[PDB]
Symmetry: D3
């Protein structure tokens, strides 16, 4: 159960890192754990559970089925406060900044700060930024998705987030998007900032993930085709 940040600050000296996103609602716990091991077949180095906002008995029951089989870390990815569980190794403690509603920026984050202090999860500080088009996290959290031809707005939100201590950033275009976050935006946020750069959504081609990672994305989030593309 060694620390996930030092784990990333140990991969990045040499290669780029990929993590597999799975939703506790889109299959049984077990069928997810065979999706889990089919991802280190390709060679992914972590699993991202959380998907959306869902009942938190399955979420634990799929983090339990994930805990035992696996030892690449499994990181929570809270669609809401129902996205916390004993079994995961690390939570992404994130604020979606380009939201229009304080609850998504700080509210949900304050209501759920006894649970992450009662339990023993690694809270990683993260700015979360929805790029156009946005996907379901687009309208779910009332976000204004940063346009594709406006990279320097994303950078402004990076620096803002870096100054407030969020050592990690996320450029989500949305799970299941036509194309990834545009490539200049990636390089540019990376230019102005020294956080771990996490790009996700709309990411399918082996070259989709070559270009996202090539554009400076420190982490690709979505196999063998793609982990070979990010190398």
């Amino acid at each position: 159960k060694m620390k996930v940040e030092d784990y990333f600050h140990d991969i990045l000296r040499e290669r780029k890192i990929h993590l597999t996103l799975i939703d506790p609602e889109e299959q049984t716990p077990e069928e997810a754990v065979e999706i889990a091991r089919a991802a280190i077949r390709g060679g992914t180095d972590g699993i991202m559970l959380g998907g959306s906002t869902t009942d938190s008995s399955e979420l634990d029951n799929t983090a339990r089925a994930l805990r035992e089989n696996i030892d690449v870390p499994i990181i929570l990815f809270p669609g809401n406060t129902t996205g916390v569980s004993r079994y995961a190794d690390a939570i992404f403690f994130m604020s979606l900044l380009n939201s229009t509603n304080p609850y998504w920026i700080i509210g949900a984050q304050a209501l759920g700060a006894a649970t992450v202090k009662k339990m023993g999860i690694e809270a990683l500080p993260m700015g979360y930024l929805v790029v156009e088009p946005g996907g379901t996290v687009g309208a779910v959290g009332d976000t204004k998705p940063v346009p594709r031809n406006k990279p320097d707005i994303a950078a402004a939100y990076a620096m803002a987030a870096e100054f407030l201590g969020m050592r990690l950033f996320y450029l989500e275009a949305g799970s299941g998007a036509p194309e990834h976050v545009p490539e200049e935006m990636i390089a540019l946020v990376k230019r102005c900032t020294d956080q771990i750069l996490i790009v996700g959504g709309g990411i399918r081609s082996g070259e989709d993930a070559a270009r996202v990672a090539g554009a400076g994305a420190d982490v690709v989030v979505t196999i063998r085709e793609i982990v070979e593309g990010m190398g």
Copy 2:
């Protein structure tokens, strides 16, 4: 002064607490204000804070040059708005108003000034910022839900989330002119739930005010209005 202020803080919390003096630049002229500032560095202040302003800043930029010519102690920006960025600031409280009703005071204004402050070598101290009843003018300017005094758990929730987002500093503001300062049973709770340097300001006038507010667990204390400062450093004794 010529070094990271955050590192300067800890070299003080080794043996005591910390006191900082708010000088709103607009309520005086620059070389009038150094005369206040050094008056402060004699009663026992450990920094000058440059804020309380949503107004002019050419004015405020001159203010900063005055103190850097004339002091050896940190002067720190307190940004009431993107106006509030100079270059002779040794540092800035890059803060977020957690209990604001409008995101501009949680992230928006920070996103806008983010470009400006990276340009300068202005040390960026990450600080969650939270206002309590009744809030002074803050409890109405930056549209806010000021946290009730008898609901401390709400200040801890905010402080703890703030601590998980990476904001290593945290500031209770009862408000410019409140009759009583921040409740002591609330200062002591957020000091326990997080590991942040806890700041507390507003309402402290008497010597015994800064006493019970530096005594209830606050690491640093903030004052405004002779050499009355040692009568406010006496109390963090």
Copy 3:
């Protein structure tokens, strides 16, 4: 029986009392013993939830109480967290004087399919915070109805009634020094047909008399 069909059934006693239990304020067990203490005279049903945050605590407490008691377990969500396999029924409620649409339709939009996934009896409820409010005051971006404006509370109540919200809930806050005024309870009751629920600041028998005597169909403590 059906839990709402049970409430209406009290066409005589006309005093549904419900006990509000917090999972995290204790353990899953003496909650049962306090539940049993509570069913031991003078209660008709068990509300659960209140405190937000953790869901682990919820499920054990719901699981432990379904077996040991004979009265309904009603979930009271402080957020989309308070949902469980082992409850009889849910107050499916909009926080009506919220300034923030998340608390009026957001969360409910976000949690509809988990109340779909169980079969849980979903009771449509209007949730109105009265001054002072409380924790749920600041937590839900309320605009707490002043005690001096019975008109305002009544207007929301007719509205929820007109949108199909069959149950109303004037909430004065856990910790309220004064329960809701009996003029606001009796106006809301004269204006709508909703099962009127009052809570917060009720700690005595004459406390629960004022609330009850004015109109309140259901009393919560």
Copy 4:
């Protein structure tokens, strides 16, 4: 003619699917509204809808006027605001604008007119009202956050949520005179997730426009 028009819709939804027509009292003399409506009873219209606009109500009362005293189909007023509440309508869609960013259109404005709606003997049909892309002008007037066209999952969730608050009808609004009507995938998904009476309107102009909508699940089609 008068009786509860919820029982009337249900009376028709066993044998067939019903149609309604949106009249704007502000585009026409109250007198014109009768021939414009009676001609639709000669057509396939099962009842008449009045509104789709916020304006002063001296005219909606003055068009409820003549429809009430001439035709034998229900007059359901379709409220552009608290303005639109006349005593001669046979019922009203008491709507929430579920995907509004502003509490005023979810609950605020309902709280202001609910006393005027109870004051009058008007049947009130509880209804969710969801704006889906492009939205037309209504999808900026309230400042809705229109549900995207390719995300019927969001629509269904609002529809379910809506159902669990006791809102028995659901309205999928494309927006008057929009280009393409509310997408078919978003219609069927709503109708299977809830027991609501589905109402669909906006940007349908053909008989084939109404064919595809009616054929994916919509109980009632609204046409301009």
Copy 5:
């Protein structure tokens, strides 16, 4: 049969202006006449019609009975966009400045404005600012001891060309808007300054008027008006 703003300025040259706020919700249109007729005998300069949000066919029948009996400006004081009528002589076209929600600042006026133009109705541009308690009226009411706050909105309002200003304690409030607040705003701006809600005495009316109010607005509460007008004069 003349311009209400000009009418406002004709009076303001040797006295202050009193207007009566009647309210078509709670009287037949004929009863409002007898009230309005009685405020006129008592010395009121204008009727203000509005103060709610409902059926507007009533707003019309009240404005028309009023228009063919009284000889005085009928003024609309709107609580939403339903508060318009062809029988008024003018409308307070107001922004609720310290609303928390844009609809009341500008959206409602965007929605309603095409109808103020469809009709010749004179529009007086008016900042509307709610001061605590604030009656029933998405407002963060200004505190009664934060007048520097109140005067900034007033100054704002002016620079945006809002010629009029309404310190609202909200009809029914226990105490009227403080004089330290009134007298701050009249020295800071050139607006016609209207103060309403909470004034029930000739005593109340005096202290408000002497603080600087140009207009005193009091509701339907019948010698009372004669008292209130006297209190001011």
Copy 6:
């Protein structure tokens, strides 16, 4: 520098339309802005708008040029004691009240203290909007734009600004500009997306009173409004 700008404006409009060169003073030190200015003024320009390197720029101009210096602020920084006048504007279709009335109220006391002429101006963003693009009016809903424009007139905003946003692909639709100009009697400013003489002329022929653009490439643009 001298005279009231609004009455300067009203006088050009008895003859022609008004073009204003917009200079962001954070984008160059003051020394070039006067060259950029005299350039603008070599082209048919009628005035300069900026929006402390801000306060330092306007300082110059006044002493070198004979057309007003107008302030075009976005935040609370955009006020300096050195301009002939200021666009005191309310971001109409903002979604946060700060850009409608708040930030005005916070900054109203600098504007009075500095005796600058203050122009009441509705300011309304258009699809796509640029970086300020807030809930921009769709490019095909000019009804919305008109409603806003008329509203701001009944509140006493005698000036009105449709902003496509700087660097926009195209300017504000002719169908919108014409409709706003026909609903209100206010000074109509249009800006963003005007790069060419033809840009300048479509916007100008559709009914705009002012045209905001930001070497002497102004001469094309001014030529255009002929």
